Amino acid sequence: SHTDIKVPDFSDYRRPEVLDSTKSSKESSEARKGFSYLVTATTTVGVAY
Amino acid sequence: AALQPQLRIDKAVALQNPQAHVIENLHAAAYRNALANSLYCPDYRIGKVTPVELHDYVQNHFTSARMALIGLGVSHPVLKQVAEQFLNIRGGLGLSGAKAKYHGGEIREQNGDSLVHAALVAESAAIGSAEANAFSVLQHVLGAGPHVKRG
Amino acid sequence: VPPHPQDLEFTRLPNGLVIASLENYAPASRIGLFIKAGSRYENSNNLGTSHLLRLASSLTTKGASSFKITRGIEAVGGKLSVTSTRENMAYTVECLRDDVDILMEFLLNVTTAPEFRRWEVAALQPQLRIDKAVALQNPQAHVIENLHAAAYRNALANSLYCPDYRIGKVTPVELHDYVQNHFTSARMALIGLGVSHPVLKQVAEQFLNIRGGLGLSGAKAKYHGGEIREQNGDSLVHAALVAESAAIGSAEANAFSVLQHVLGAGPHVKRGSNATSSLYQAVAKGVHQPFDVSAFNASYSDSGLFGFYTISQAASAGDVIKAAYNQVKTIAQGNLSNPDVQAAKNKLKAGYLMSVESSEGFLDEVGSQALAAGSYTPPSTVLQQIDAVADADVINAAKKFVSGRKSMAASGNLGHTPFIDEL
Amino acid sequence: MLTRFLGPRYRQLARNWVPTAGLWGAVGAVGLVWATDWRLILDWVPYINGKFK
Amino acid sequence: MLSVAARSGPFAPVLSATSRGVAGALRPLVQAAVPATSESPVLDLKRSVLCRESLRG
Amino acid sequence: TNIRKSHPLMKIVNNAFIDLPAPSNISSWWNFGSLLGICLILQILTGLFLAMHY
Amino acid sequence: TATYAQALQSVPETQVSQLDNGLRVASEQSSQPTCTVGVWIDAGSRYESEKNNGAGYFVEHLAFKGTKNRPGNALEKEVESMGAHLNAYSTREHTAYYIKALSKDLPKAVELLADIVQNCSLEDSQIEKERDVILQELQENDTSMRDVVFNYLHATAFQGTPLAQSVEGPSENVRKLSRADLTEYLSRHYKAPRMVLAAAGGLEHRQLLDLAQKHFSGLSGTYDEDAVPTLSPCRFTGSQICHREDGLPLAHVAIAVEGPGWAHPDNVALQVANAIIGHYDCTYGGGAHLSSPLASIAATNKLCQSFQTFNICYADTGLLGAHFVCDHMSIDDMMFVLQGQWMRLCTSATESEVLRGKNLLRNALVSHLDGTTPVCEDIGRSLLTYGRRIPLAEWESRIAEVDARVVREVCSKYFYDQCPAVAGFGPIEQLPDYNRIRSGMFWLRF
């Protein structure tokens, strides 16, 4: 009965680099963390000024 | 729900007399049946007795033919009145003898406990019969409790 | 071409100690010190002492601290295990070949130099309550405790788990006492796999010359009988029915072991009707709901218990028991074919062989053989033993169970569970 | 009280943490240099020339 | 054939330094979990299920 | 175990500004409480630097 | 004497020969009186569709209940009567049927496996009986918090991929699966180039190959001429599943990063790092003195009833991490202490603890490979994953190569600043928020 629990489809929210179920996420983990960490690095740089 | 834990305290307070468990066990071993049941609730049942079980117990045991209304310092008309008005319930079991099948055997409880408690017993006689009165006399030939303080 | 297999070396020393080794050229090594020190040697004044003892294996020794035993064994990735039964304690030690020395030393300290420090024992007492709680969550553990307490008035009545009233009451002195008078040369066996005979003989000669305790393997099981009943609520009913049988090693026991396979042990096929299991087929005939039934066979130094064990719904309990019981009765009455026994022989023979195929099961067998017999009996002759059991002996084993003063333990809703009386 | 901290594990523990401890010093240096405007250090920097005479 | 594991029946407890505690021999079970509705006492202040020094390459 | 939970100074901070169980749905209208705290501190630092020359 | 090194060379080479079918037939010989024989199949749940999710699991229930040559009982009766044991299992990637029997009984053992694997009498009356059996087993599994959290972890980590599916399938697929559905998967998957006949014990590889041609040859004629299926990669998702149930007394939490898969050489270093952290359970006697810092902090502070590390491998992917069970108030501390150890290992792994990890692993590997059943399983699985049997000396070689640097390089590769898959069940109010869990995947000091 717990075997019916599938995770709801997330396609609506998924970053485009990880929309393909047949594609490894590792390929795009580097680039994806890059963006969000660049935003942060740029933010701190701005705050620092 | 809130009263369930009182079973564990109630049982703990009685069971601190070594005699209570001895007489529980004595009965569980004597009878395969109804008198085998203890006056205290088995641990596995605490918090498991349902509101329905008690409703059920009352509806089928607290009935007219299983009941007596005794009054001291009251009048007979008043007792008879409340009996006629409030105690006309019937719709449960009938038999005083759902029936004790005496069986026998022993129960042994290793304890550590300062000194040893042991009860040895055989089937005797149902209350009311002539035989029971002989047993009651036997009990005084052999010895009940003391009569003199420190004797 | 594999390597031509070596032969087991065996030696009884004059002092009564036994050494057995086998160089199996395995990448790992296993050493077991087996001791006649199981639960049966406890008395009514020191119950559970051999439980806490079993739990005490990494407390502080002369020559190795608690912390060393742990970190030392963990550093080399070995194990220190202790397995109690009603008759034996067995201290086992595993590691890679190159590391036998450090683990041996640890072994010897745990078994011969335990210090049992006041505060260390104090801190370990609560493990008895967890250890007991974790076992007792199998309904089978309490059933077999109770089965024994009812069967025997005596030594095998004692449980492998410590009675509740004893938890936090076992003294540092009680364990010192238990070791000094049970962990002695004449009550001991040092078994080694992936080790050499000279080395075992050396450590035996050097470190295991202890004697100053009890003598008898038979302080003596007085079989008595009767039943214990435990009202439970518990989903389904557990019941074991048993009579006194035969002491391990005797010819009679082998007949009982065959009887057990005629009637039915555990399953052989994953999810099956257990077609050859005559007990299972017998109950199934008139019980059309979830149940289990197996022949139960326990063999000891001076007594034995044979019968059957049942798992069933509360209301089916008495039907399941009566059906199982009558099935035994028919074998006592003479209703047993030659191929029926032949299959039981094959089931037993194969099962035994499989039981010793790994080094864990091998070492345990050589250990228990060393204590019960003072011998190593090769598989080749164990199979010959089994073969010598005739159909008439298996019948005679069933006849002994049927006509013998029963013992019974059971737990669940006992409302529809019979009473020996009514069997 | 310090003899307990000397042995092969601590030799490995120091080496494991030194690229990091060095890079935090570079952070602190650049950080101090940038914040106080240490024209002593900053004059020799190929773009930061706010002292443009 | 002398071992209370090889005569699959009576109880044996096992304790260890690195490994989980074991119990018992035989005794029904395994042919009691095929006739279903046997959920078993699961995790109510309890040890590790299965035991793991069976790790691979 | 956790240094951030059991230290008699960091514990008090943790239970007020870090691990505090807060509602999932509080509006931008709940921001003014902290913004008051910012305002109060801002007035102190400008206030003092003003009090130095006044 | 005999050095640990020499012992590894003494273990005989696993001999491999191939049938014209493509059935790889392999054995490890010994002087043992018994043996284990089996068929390992390259099939599981990862091959299933969503619309036939319990299919492999269903065949597993039908495989022992009758053939064309042995209707109903007959199989059991034969296996039972020679004293043999017959078992089966199915993971998401592999299905196996094996017989433990006497070495002399190997001719019938192989014969029966051939009949089971090729001539499954999927009688409609029996498939209906199995429907109830499997459905009842679904309700049974629900009560095992550990079986759930791992299915849940699979469901969330492999979101939308075939790997997200359980082995047993959902209830509706058990209720509606037909004989056609079953025969189709059977014919598409139980094909000879995806089957390994494995044996171990008192054997002769000559005698086994003879039997393999005698009983399995019958899959020739024509093969693979219309359709061939090869596995597609499965996307890992750093996600969370939280099943909040405040009526179960202990919390189960399983947390994992994406692992590399069966083939990858760096599974060894992972296993070593896992060995260091290890596993704990309330019945361990060591307590305070345990080497693994997590185990000792768990024991001292009773932070936990049990924890275990794992490196679950699938082709080109996996789950790397730990699972624990604990009281409601201890989830936070368990996570902190666990993630702190991953990071300690990622950044500052020391040489001696890496020896202990290597040592635990050599001991585990050698202890596991004890007896006909574990070794036969190892031959079958290895051939299906690695394409060969990796001999013990090679494992030792690859273990000895791992040092402190290897551990911290490899642990960082997989753990450092990576998104966990997190599955929680039971009294989980105190289970950290995903952001917080994800923040424990790095250190501000490093």
Ligand code: HEC
């Ligand atoms: C360090 C002492 C100090 C603190 C703290 C302080 N101030 Fe002041 N404030 C001053 C001084 C001095 C002046 C006069 C100089 C000036 O007008 O700028 C002043 C000026 C003012 C004025 C007049 C503004 C103008 O320039 O027209 C207001 C209004 C005021 N403060 C309100 C506040 C409030 C509100 C707070 C926070 C509760 C506060 N101040 C905090 C010292 C303080």
